[PDB]
Write an enzyme that holds these catalytic residues in place. Structure first.
Site, short mmCIF file in Angstrom:
data_model
loop_
_atom_site.label_atom_id
_atom_site.label_comp_id
_atom_site.label_asym_id
_atom_site.label_seq_id
_atom_site.Cartn_x
_atom_site.Cartn_y
_atom_site.Cartn_z
N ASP A 153 0.85 -1.20 0.00
CA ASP A 153 0.00 0.00 0.00
C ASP A 153 0.87 1.24 0.00
OD1 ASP A 153 -1.22 -2.26 1.18
OD2 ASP A 153 -2.62 -1.04 2.30
N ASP A 174 -0.63 -2.87 -4.17
CA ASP A 174 -1.83 -2.86 -3.34
C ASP A 174 -2.40 -1.46 -3.44
OD1 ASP A 174 -3.72 -3.11 -0.89
OD2 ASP A 174 -2.83 -5.10 -1.00
N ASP A 175 -3.27 -1.07 -2.52
CA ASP A 175 -3.88 0.24 -2.59
C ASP A 175 -2.94 1.40 -2.77
OD1 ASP A 175 -6.65 -0.39 -2.45
OD2 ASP A 175 -6.39 -0.77 -0.31
N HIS A 196 -4.00 -1.58 -6.23
CA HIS A 196 -5.40 -1.94 -6.07
C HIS A 196 -6.35 -0.75 -6.15
CE1 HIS A 196 -4.45 -6.01 -3.91
NE2 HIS A 196 -3.91 -5.91 -5.10
N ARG A 229 -12.77 2.54 -5.37
CA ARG A 229 -13.28 1.50 -4.50
C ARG A 229 -13.68 1.96 -3.10
NH1 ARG A 229 -10.06 -4.07 -3.04
NH2 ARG A 229 -8.37 -2.59 -2.54
N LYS A 231 -15.23 -0.03 0.30
CA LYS A 231 -15.61 -1.31 0.88
C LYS A 231 -15.98 -1.12 2.34
CE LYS A 231 -11.51 -2.71 0.26
NZ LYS A 231 -10.42 -3.56 0.80
ZN LIG Z 1 -2.98 -7.58 -6.14
#
Ligand SMILES: [Zn+2]
Ligand SMILES: *[C@@H]1O[C@H](CO)[C@@H](O)[C@H](O)[C@H]1NC(C)=O
Ligand SMILES: [Zn+2]
Ligand SMILES: [Zn+2]
EC number: 3.2.1.15
Length: 335
Positions: A153, A174-175, A196, A229, A231
């Site tokens: 991240d 990742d993020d 991500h 995104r 969540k």
């Molecule tokens: Zn991934």
């Protein structure tokens, strides 16, 4: 005083009396944090040369900084090279214990500008601070794409009020941005590659499940799992509000162009959204681009009544599967 440190130990010992701290080519000892916590207010910290870290399987952080009114910069040509491939094993938070990179916890009313970061073994910046600004920060974890980088991240934000991330450049796994909690977060002009996406959440099951007033704009997401995104955790309570994604361009998206779902259980979507976490004032404005043929363009899986008051203008996601499983989203929106 103006201080220049060539070792992490000297920096830790003498930092308090320094109004200017120049960190010159410091090789941080194995399993040790370049401890720049408790800095005196107004201290300027300058990274010079190449900062490296000896190898050891541990949780980090490799660098920790705190204090008020701190100005962090990097000299021309500097680099903080974590050489994370030494840890990367395709498992991220699992497998070898990998150190988190930089703890900006209590680094209040401070700025971090122009830092050039390379190959963090795990997450880059952990933000738990107020009135913190990250400008022109580059996190180059490109090597992680083929050397097993995961959970790298770029910016993880929690328990922070007033976070500004201006023109970050990120290539990770990742993020690009992950906000589990916080208020008044501004992310603009970002280049998010390989990760991500720009994510709010997963929200829920923490001491703070409130995300309020997050503006993510003028950002381009490339070769990422998701672009936009949000969540929320199944059965969890909390509040996500005043979220604005504006002028987001995406391409090379593998999973979701735009995804707002409230069915995360044990870290995995279930298809059963709950309504304990409200998602209000979500504004998507000019969110466009393409996703892979196997990716879902837009997926809105809201709990009953938890998603309210949205603004949806010029959201055009192409090239993927058009979801027929969306539900409980404000009628202004569409999959
Ligand atoms: Zn991934
Ligand atoms: C939202 O955050 C932005 C950026 O920090 C700030 O300018 C604005 O005042 C905030 N608005 C509210 C209602 O909190
Ligand atoms: Zn190496
Ligand atoms: Zn102040």
């Amino acid at each position: 005083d103006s201080c220049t440190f060539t070792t992490a130990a000297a920096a830790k010992a003498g930092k308090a009396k320094c109004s200017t701290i120049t960190l010159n080519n410091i090789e941080v000892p194995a399993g040790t944090t370049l401890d720049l916590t408790g800095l005196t207010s107004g201290t300027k910290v300058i990274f010079e040369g190449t900062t490296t870290f000896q190898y050891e399987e541990w949780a980090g952080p490799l660098i920790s900084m705190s204090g008020e009114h701190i100005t962090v910069t990097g000299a021309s040509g500097h680099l903080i090279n974590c050489d994370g491939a030494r840890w990367w094993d395709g498992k991220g938070t699992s497998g070898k214990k990998k150190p988190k990179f930089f703890y900006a916890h209590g680094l209040d009313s401070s700025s971090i500008t122009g830092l050039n970061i390379k190959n963090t073994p795990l997450m880059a910046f952990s933000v738990q601070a107020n009135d913190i600004t990250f400008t022109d920060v580059t996190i180059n974890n490109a090597d992680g794409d083929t050397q097993g980088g995961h959970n790298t991240d770029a910016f993880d934000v929690g328990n922070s009020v007033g976070v500004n991330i201006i023109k970050p450049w990120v290539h990770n796994q990742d993020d690009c941005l992950a906000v589990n909690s916080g208020e008044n977060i501004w992310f603009t002009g970002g280049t998010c590659i390989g990760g991500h996406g720009l994510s709010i959440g997963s929200v829920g099951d923490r001491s703070n499940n409130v995300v309020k007033n997050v503006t993510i704009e003028h950002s381009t997401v490339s070769n990422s799992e998701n672009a936009v995104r949000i969540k929320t955790i199944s059965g969890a309570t909390g509040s996500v509000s005043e979220i604005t994604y504006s002028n987001i361009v995406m391409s090379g998206i593998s999973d979701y162009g735009v995804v707002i779902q409230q069915d995360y259980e044990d870290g995995k979507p279930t298809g059963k959204p709950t309504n304990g976490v409200t998602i209000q004032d979500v504004k998507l404005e000019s969110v466009t681009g393409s996703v892979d043929s196997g990716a879902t363009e837009i997926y809105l899986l809201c709990g009953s009544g938890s998603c309210s008051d949205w603004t949806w203008d010029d959201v055009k996601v192409t090239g993927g599967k058009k979801s027929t499983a969306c539900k409980n989203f404000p009628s202004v929106a569409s999959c």
